[PDB]
Design a protein around this ligand. Structure first.
Ligand SMILES: Nc1nc2c(ncn2[C@@H]2O[C@H](CO)[C@@H](OP(=O)(O)O)[C@H]2O)c(=O)[nH]1
Ligand SMILES: [Ca+2]
Length: 104
């Protein structure tokens, strides 16, 4: 069973942990990857009810199981905060334009 389901993409807790650790490490060194510069601030315009405090940073999680390193980021993202605490897993799938919805 999926721990997080973003549309057709199925992710386990280890998939999320691996992605988060990669993005947080980059955040710490103050470095970015990709043309859209990941990771970067997630403003939470959607107003999701997160259990942890802001600021939030988004980092893409890939269905291939690879750690993001550039190019198309896909539709899924892991959102973590300053203390490397998982805020949630979100996706562009099933959401209008460039909005997000939470993965079930
Ligand atoms: N939809 C959305 N985008 C945000 C938010 N905060 C920052 N952004 C950035 O603006 C862009 C609008 O889609 C997003 O790019 P993304 O597709 O790479 O996630 C995202 O990086 C937010 O709260 N909601
Ligand atoms: Ca997996």
């Amino acid at each position: 069973a999926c721990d997080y389901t973003c549309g057709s993409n199925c992710y386990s807790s280890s998939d999320v942990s691996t992605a988060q650790a990669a993005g947080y490490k980059l955040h710490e060194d103050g470095e970015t990857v990709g043309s859209n510069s990941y990771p970067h601030k997630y403003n939470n315009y959607e107003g999701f009810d997160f259990s942890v405090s802001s600021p939030y940073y988004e980092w893409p999680i890939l269905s291939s199981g690879d750690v993001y390193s550039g190019g198309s980021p896909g539709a899924d993202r892991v959102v973590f905060n300053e203390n490397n605490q998982l805020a949630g897993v979100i996706t562009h799938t099933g959401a209008s334009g460039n909005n997000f919805v939470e993965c079930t």
